Amino acid sequence: SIIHIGAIFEENAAKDDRVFQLAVSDLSLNDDILQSEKITYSIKVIEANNPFQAVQEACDLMTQGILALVTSTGCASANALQSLTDAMHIPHLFVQRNPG
Amino acid sequence: SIIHIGAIFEENAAKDDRVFQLAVSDLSLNDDILQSEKITYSIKVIEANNPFQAVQEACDLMTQGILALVTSTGCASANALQSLTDAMHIPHLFVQRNPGGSPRTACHLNPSPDGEAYTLASRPPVRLNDVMLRLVTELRWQKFVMFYDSEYDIRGLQSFLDQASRLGLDVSLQKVDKNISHVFTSLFTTMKTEELNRYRDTLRRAILLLSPQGAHSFINEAVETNLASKDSHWVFVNEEISDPEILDLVHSALGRMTVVRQIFPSAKDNQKCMRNNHRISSLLCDPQEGYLQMLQISNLYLYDSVLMLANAFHRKLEDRKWHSMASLNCIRKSTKPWNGGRSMLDTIKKGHITGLTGVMEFREDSSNPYVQFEILGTTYSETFGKDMRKLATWDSEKGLNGSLLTLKVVTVLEEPFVMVAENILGQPKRYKGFSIDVLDALAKALGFKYEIYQAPDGRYGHQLHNTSWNGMIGELISKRADLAISAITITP
Amino acid sequence: YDIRGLQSFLDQASRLGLDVSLQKVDKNISHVFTSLFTTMKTEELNRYRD
Amino acid sequence: YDSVLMLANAFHRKLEDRKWHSMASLNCIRKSTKPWNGGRSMLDTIKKGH
């Protein structure tokens, strides 16, 4: 198999990606346990506090079949996602966006 | 042409699954422009706070074609259905859910420009920082209380918490339980009795902001706990209360009250409940049992949402346009839109009818601000009952047209100041002297009282070499009494 | 940030007799004190200042 | 970043368990969805992490 996870971030998603993509990059350089596979990521950027774009940008990720999900969005981007991740059993490590 | 509409109503969809076709039947029956046309509907009853459960109920009905969507949901669960109606250009009729008739709270949404209101809130707005600024001025307030339950989003008049610093008055603010017995439990056990009676006399000016049901359970018991002896005012203004539970509050009350709901002139007659050649089902045009007082706000905002559609779809039949939404996955970003939605945006936002709720205009940011009450009021009296008299009328146009004790006394020894004057079988009975006559002058013109306590020290309590006060002073400080009003030796 | 984030301190500043008085803060205080001078009089300004 | 550290730790503990499963590709707009049946013992691996 392979590891494939989801990564959807609220605006501004630039320094969400400054942390995420470089954090995932240094993993395979040094680890001996996740060397038999590789963590595959695909960033899907949505609107500000819109869960509908999170649904449309995540249905392709389940058409990609993600195992987990990395979210940094506000409280107005999780009610459809909490009603979605209870269906797919996905660990939804939700972290609230600081509003400015 | 596939003439289908969706309508998703979450918990509780009970009157949503009862009252809904009281107009839909009369649509298919009594409309002449939609005669030689076919009329359908939808009724969903799904579980509450479930947006993605409603997504497979919305992505499945989008395959069937939807011309207008009527919802009753909340803030966090409908930003998806807000942004669903932007690309396909679909109307989105909406009611804010509340449990039992408690107040409401508006929402906060995406950083999109103003003008697009596919989502429209049918419910009347919170104009209530204004009416609070009325009554903090027009009804002689300086020090008072307000309340709220566990089950309402408390941020409704959090704005009004801010002018409160600017005027200079004082408010008290506590949460109401979901058990009335737990309220009196914490108010008789968990506190200080002196602080209780302080708070109780503060509670003589108090405000609940609640449903008309658990508050009705509370208030008459709060009366029955003797929190009102003669009169003071307690306030709530709402949009719905049945006339018996009005009287079961305020005829079970002699004091000053506030019971305000929402009124509209309706029509007694057939061919007078008619807009756009369609019937308004009401008590006066469909009389039922238990329906003299069926006063939920969602009645007129659903029968008039019917008539607001019945104006517009007749106009759309005149618009000579049709487009059927096809079967689709809602994974798409560049979806297939509906071309008729621009006219459907304009025959509804600029669409309006004048009926038994007045005039229903619309703005471009999910609001109908127009609303008008009337207010019947009474004070404390016994010569006419607590029957009602008009004292005000509010509207969004003009504002409010028409406008608006045993105490803790410990005492000292030495009878040549104040004596135990009487000592009877079982009781040292009456205690007379100088400050007793002062207490007589206090008690005389009010009917307010005292409780005389003995200090057998008679200390004239002194600052010790103990950082404390012997005898009497330090236990006023330790607050087993709070007044020792007597001949007291004057030391700084 | 909302009042629902600190709901019960209303109810406990209540219980200790602690005098609650809020004002919501907008964007710039440069916009704030100007509107405090233009709208208010000086009694509610400087009495409540102390 | 702590959510990257905890999940990569749960990746290492899952391969330390020497069992693996991966989530299937699906369009969940359908009612026909397969729930991820290994949602508890791996959840026991992730809840007890530090």
**Are B95 and B206 in contact, with CB atoms under 8 Å apart?**
no
For the packed helices B180-188 and B214-224, what is the interaxial angle rounded to 10 degrees?
A: 40
> What are the structure tokens assigned to B208, written together?
């609940």
Q: Cβ–Cβ contacts within 10 Å for residue C49, how many?
A: 8
Residue B45 contacts residue B17 (beta carbons within 8 Å): yes
**3-state secondary structure (DSSP) of residue A25:** helix
Cis upstream peptide for B49 (omega within 30°)? no
D4 vs B310: CA distance, rounded Å: 54
Q: Do the two chains C and D touch, given a threshold of 8 Å on CB pairs and at least 3 pairs? A: no
Amino acid at B135: L
Retrieve residue B30's tokens.
Answer: 């009594």
Round to whole Å and give the CA distance between B469 and B447.
34
CB half-sphere exposure, D45, CA atoms < 13 A = 20
- Measured from the Cβ of residue B110, the count of other Cβ atoms closer than 10 Å reads 17
C-alpha separations of B394 from B47, B146, B240, B397 in Å: 37, 22, 15, 8
Beta bridge partners of B452: B409
The sign of the torsion formed by the CA atoms of B13, B360, B362, B334 equals: positive
Return the axis-axis angle of helices B300-319 and B21-30, rounded to nearest 10°: 40
Partners of A62 in beta bridges: none
- Supply φ then ψ for residue B354, to 5 degrees: -105, 115
Tokens 């969903």, located at residue: B44
Start-to-end CA span in chain C (Å): 26
A/D interface, count of CB pairs below 8 Å: 75
Any idea which residue has 């016994």 for tokens?
Answer: B382
For residue D28 the two structure tokens come to 């969940």
CB B423 within 8 A of CB B429: yes
Question: Chain B to chain C, count of Cβ pairs less than 8 Å apart?
Answer: 55
Neighbors of chain B with 3 or more C-beta pairs under 8 Å: A, C, D
How near does any CA of chain A get to the CA of B47, in Å? 11
Alpha helices in B31-153 (DSSP H): 51-58, 79-84, 128-138
B-chain residues near C23 (CB < 8 A): 162, 165-166
d(C-alpha A65, C-alpha A24), whole Å: 19
Q: Are strands B8-10 and B431-433 parallel, antiparallel or unpaired?
A: unpaired
**How close, in Å, is residue B56 to chain D by CA atoms?**
6
In angstroms, what separates the C-alpha of B335 from chain A's closest C-alpha?
A: 11
Which residues of chain A neighbour D1 with C-beta distances below 8 Å?
Answer: 19-20, 23
Cβ(B19)–Cβ(B299) below 8 Å = yes
The residue among A61, D31, A86, B73 whose CA lies nearest residue A53 is: A61
Q: CB of C45 within 8 Å of any CB in chain B?
A: no
First to last CA, chain B: 94
| Beta-bridge partner residues of B473 | none
| Core vs surface per residue B398-408: b (16+ CB within 10 A) or e | eebeeebeebb
CB contact under 8 A, D3 and A93: yes
The CA–CA distances, whole Å, from D18 to A33, A67, D14, D15, D21 equal: 11, 17, 7, 5, 10
Token digits of residue B244: 């018996």
What DSSP character marks residue B251?
T
Rg (CA), chain B: 31
A18 interfaces chain D, CB cutoff of 8 Å: no
Residue A61 contacts B, CB cutoff 8 Å:
no
Q: Cβ A81–B55 below 8 Å, yes or no?
A: no
For residues B143 and B91, is the Cβ–Cβ distance under 8 A? no
Structure tokens at D2: 């702590």
Closest-CA residue of D relative to B54 is D29
| Rounded CA separation B77/A78 (Å) | 9
Q: Which residues face B453 on adjacent strands?
A: B410
Q: How many other C-beta atoms lie within 10 A of the C-beta of residue B141?
A: 16
- DSSP, collapsed to helix, strand or coil, labels residue C33 as helix
Q: Are strands B399-401 and B389-395 parallel, antiparallel or unpaired?
A: antiparallel
**Structure token pair of residue B458:** 């008679």
Whose structure tokens read 């809602």? B330
Alpha carbon distance B134, B20 (integer Å): 38
Q: What is the DSSP string of B150-200?
A: SSS-STTSTTHHHHHHHH--B--EEE--S-HHHHHHHHHTSS-HHHHHHHH
Alpha helices in B255-349 (DSSP H): 300-319, 341-349
Residue B311 pairs in a beta bridge with: none
Q: Which residues of B7-39 are buried (b: 16+ CB within 10 A; e: fewer)?
A: bbbbeebeebeebbebbbebbbeebebbeeeeb
Q: Does B423 touch chain D (CB under 8 A)?
A: no
CA distance B314 to B309: 8
B214 three-state secondary structure = helix
DSSP-derived 3-state class of residue B72: strand
Which of D12, D28, D36 minimises the CB distance to A33?
D12
Cβ–Cβ of B56/D29 closer than 8 Å? yes
Please, what's the b/e burial string for A56-69 (b: 16 or more CB within 10 A of its CB; e: otherwise)? bbbbbbbebebbbb
Residue B89 CA to residue B55 CA, distance in Å, equals: 17
Q: Nearest residue of B to residue C46 by CA position?
A: B166
Q: Does A54 touch chain D (CB under 8 A)?
A: no
The reply to whether residue A51 touches residue B80, judged by beta carbons under 8 angstroms, is: yes
How is residue B453 annotated by DSSP? Answer: E
What φ, ψ does residue B70 adopt, rounded to 5°?
A: -110, 120
Token output for B160: 């009004």
Distance CA B283, CA B288 (A): 7
Please answer yes or no on whether B59 and D29 come within 8 Å at the CB atom: yes
Distance from C-alpha of B419 to C-alpha of B442, rounded to nearest angstrom:
19
For residues B60 and B46, is the Cβ–Cβ distance under 8 A?
no
Cα separation, A6 vs A61, whole angstroms: 6
Instruction: Classify residue B77 as exposed, middle or buried by CB count within 10 Å of its CB (0-12, 13-18, 19+).
Output: buried
